[PDB]
């Protein structure tokens, strides 16, 4: 649970309440089926790997810098890297996985288009932050 650390940082990044952004709430259709169940712990590494990847990509944009605290984003990247690297090492090693990865990527595509559409408003950003926050917990717990 140095993943517990990643959520803690995301929490601290919050600037505005979702309750002032109720107009902007959105269902992103997180492809949850692709993780916890059936093909249990360990067969879902590559999917989880892609997730972290996508998150890292998302929060590295100059738009993300404009949205969130520069200091926290740093501690955040450190944390993502740690995981990103460990997961990659496993993927590299031995243990429709493509469909699963595709599903994750489509999910983040939807997230990105949502922000473009909303013109990266603080509210849009808050909605997204809250989602990732949730869908990350689901991925891992």
């Amino acid at each position: 649970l140095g993943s517990r650390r990643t959520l803690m940082l995301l929490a601290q990044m919050r600037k505005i309440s979702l309750f002032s952004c109720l107009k902007d709430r959105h269902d992103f259709g997180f492809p949850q089926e692709e993780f916890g169940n059936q093909f249990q712990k360990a067969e879902t590494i590559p999917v989880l790997h892609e997730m972290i990847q996508q998150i890292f990509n998302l929060f590295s944009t100059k738009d993300s810098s404009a949205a969130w605290d520069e200091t926290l984003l740093d501690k955040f990247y450190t944390e993502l890297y740690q995981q990103l690297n460990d997961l990659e090492a496993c993927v590299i090693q031995g243990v429709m996985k493509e469909d699963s990865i595709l599903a994750v990527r489509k999910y983040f595509q939807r997230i990105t288009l949502y922000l473009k559409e909303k013109k990266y408003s603080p509210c849009a950003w808050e909605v997204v932050r809250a989602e990732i926050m949730r869908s990350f917990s689901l991925s891992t717990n």
């Epitope: 959520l7 803690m8 929490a11 919050r14 979702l18 309750f19 709430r25 959105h26 269902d27 259709g29 997180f30 949850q32 089926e33 939807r110 809250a130 926050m133 949730r134 917990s137 689901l138 717990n141």
Partner: antibody, heavy 117, light 112 residues
Framework: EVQLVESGGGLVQPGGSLRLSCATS????????IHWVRQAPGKGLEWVAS????????NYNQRFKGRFTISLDKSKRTAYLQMNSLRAEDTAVYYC??????????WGQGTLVTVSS | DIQMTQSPSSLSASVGDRVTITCRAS??????????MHWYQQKPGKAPKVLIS???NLESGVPSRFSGSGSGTDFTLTISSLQPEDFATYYC?????????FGQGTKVEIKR
Amino acid sequence: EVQLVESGGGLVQPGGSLRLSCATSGYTFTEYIIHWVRQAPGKGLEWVASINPDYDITNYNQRFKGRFTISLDKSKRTAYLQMNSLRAEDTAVYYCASWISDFFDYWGQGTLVTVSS
Amino acid sequence: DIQMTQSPSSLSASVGDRVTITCRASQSVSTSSYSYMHWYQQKPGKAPKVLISYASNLESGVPSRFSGSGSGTDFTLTISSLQPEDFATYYCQHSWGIPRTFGQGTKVEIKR
């Protein structure tokens, strides 16, 4: 003024099949996710499936994965629930419901499905 | 997947009384910042009606006697001044992923 109208309910024998439809009106179609939620008489509420018209995502309660199919016709502003191999425990009022996210904003009046010989 | 247990199942109280219904999720339905648990009201022969969203956000048009608190796994609907028109069954549901599940419901009847 948002309005959800489910129809196609009635009587079927066990093992038979049915197709519920829900006709929507009064809002931009692609903005709401449409759900089916049922309720056995006297009993509690059970989520069946949802469909997202904006994208094309669907989700199912694992209980009904094999038998039930949700689908839609965007031109007709209508969502459908195809039920198969109906057991007697599928007797319930089937609500059509909508949401933008997390919680339900709108509902139909419900349509009663009775599975009996 | 996430199951929830309301208590009491059934309940009786006089008009004006304070009423408390609780809902217990089989696992956390919270982020450190938001709880994804909602409360509905179903009057007999009618579709449910959302009251509280995200554990404590009172929905538009709902009377102020209604309120929700809680986080993690333990949540509470409170009617502070029970009224005759508040006779109904009350359900909790979560939107912490899939499947979406409701509680078994809590029947509230008015003592007169």
